């Protein structure tokens, strides 16, 4: 209930500054996201890249997620057991960079990017947990 309430659950600990849920089936669209932030502006084309059959093209120059440039760390979305993705934002002029994680469920994609100085493992473990719960709910 209340797709936005998950975002509140995502922001309970304050270790992240952006969080979103998007349904990647049929026409991609955001179901709940932090207003005014990065994750609210996800385009279907970016979703198609994330779930596309090509798992090597995003290694040449990274990819964009909501228009913000980010680099690929490890890709395990299509592999059973984790269904998780790791990204790090790409910045210019020594601007702060942040770790980005994406977990793939049956119907949804869960996206978390943490605040400054936050280790990716903390961001990954949370997104895996709620993704694990959400798949147990047949979504």
């Amino acid at each position: 209930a209340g797709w936005n309430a998950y975002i509140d659950n995502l922001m309970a600990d304050g270790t992240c500054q952006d969080a979103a849920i998007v349904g990647y089936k049929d026409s991609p669209c955001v179901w709940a996201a932090v207003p005014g932030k990065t994750f609210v502006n996800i385009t279907p084309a970016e979703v198609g890249v994330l779930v596309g059959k090509d798992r090597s093209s995003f290694y040449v120059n990274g990819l964009t997620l909501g228009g913000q440039k980010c680099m690929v760390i490890r890709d395990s979305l299509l592999q059973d057991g984790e269904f998780s993705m790791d990204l790090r934002t790409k910045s210019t002029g020594g601007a702060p960079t942040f770790n980005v994680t994406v977990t793939k469920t049956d119907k949804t994609l869960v996206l978390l990017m943490g605040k400054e100085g936050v280790h990716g493992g903390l961001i990954n473990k949370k997104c895996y947990e709620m993704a694990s719960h959400l798949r147990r709910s047949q979504y």
């Binding site: 290694y59 040449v60 490890r74 960079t97």
Partner: protein, 370 residues
Amino acid sequence: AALVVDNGSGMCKAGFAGDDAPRAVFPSIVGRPRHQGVMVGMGQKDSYVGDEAQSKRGILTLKYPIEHGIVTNWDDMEKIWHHTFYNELRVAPEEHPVLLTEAPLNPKANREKMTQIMFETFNTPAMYVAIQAVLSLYASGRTTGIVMDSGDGVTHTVPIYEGYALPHAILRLDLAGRDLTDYLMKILTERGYSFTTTAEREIVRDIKEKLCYVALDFEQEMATAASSSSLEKSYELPDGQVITIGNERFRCPEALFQPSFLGMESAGIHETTFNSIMKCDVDIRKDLYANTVLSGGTTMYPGIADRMQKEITALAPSTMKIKIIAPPERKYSVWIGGSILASLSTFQQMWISKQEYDESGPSIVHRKCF
């Protein structure tokens, strides 16, 4: 005090967090006598490891428990660790967390296997496992770069970035020190010296460490070596025999740059360094070139740094600058970086506890310490 133990194909390193040098540095070998014992009452041991095995290596059949990175014998691997704690370090593991290292692109099979033998046989209170390549540049004082990791078993090229490994960009090359030592003996027989057994395999290992060096120009040096006897050097065998090598000083190390000398289709580390950095992103590629680092005992050859700098410069575009970082302490860089990592105050966060392992089981390591 947290133990930092560095298992390696050739050498095993152990010490304490915050120390500037490993406390115990002994060979990673296991020995079993091939002859029956006739002198009774001595209490001669069944298996011999480390320096003591090296001391009496003549009457022992030395075996490397780890070959090509993969551990081929899990029963011997604990014994050298058992000797590591109680004998070399003389410390009880029951009250100290211990640090071990893992290899790039390691199969998932091993990673709980070390986990399931430490929390049970030695019941260490806490544990953490990281890449030896990641710890290499940590000792160098940088967090982003590419490491020219070469050792006794395997070689890996890891373009690290904020201390997070890139699995797709990891390139594995099978040109290690053991290969060169095996290549040194097959070319040393040209001078009438025949070393075949495993005990004398250490002898040639000693010879190349002292006499072999990297030549800047191969074609120029063979011509000079044939013309003059200046490059020839004399080495002393433990039996008192005197040997002399004329051109093998620069020929054996050259195979690291010309693998076709060994017959391997994969080319040298100079292109493999260039090959790996081609896989990374273009924008980050600027940083990786200028913070290249060398690591491992294989990279100890004199004149190796300028030779690789010259070759990759031709491979690299003329616009780019190449800065080969070769700290003289890079022999123990992997060990020192671990001691640095263990000493961190924030390092207590990603500990794996004995209690938490019990409910989580062996599988916790893949997600806790990754």
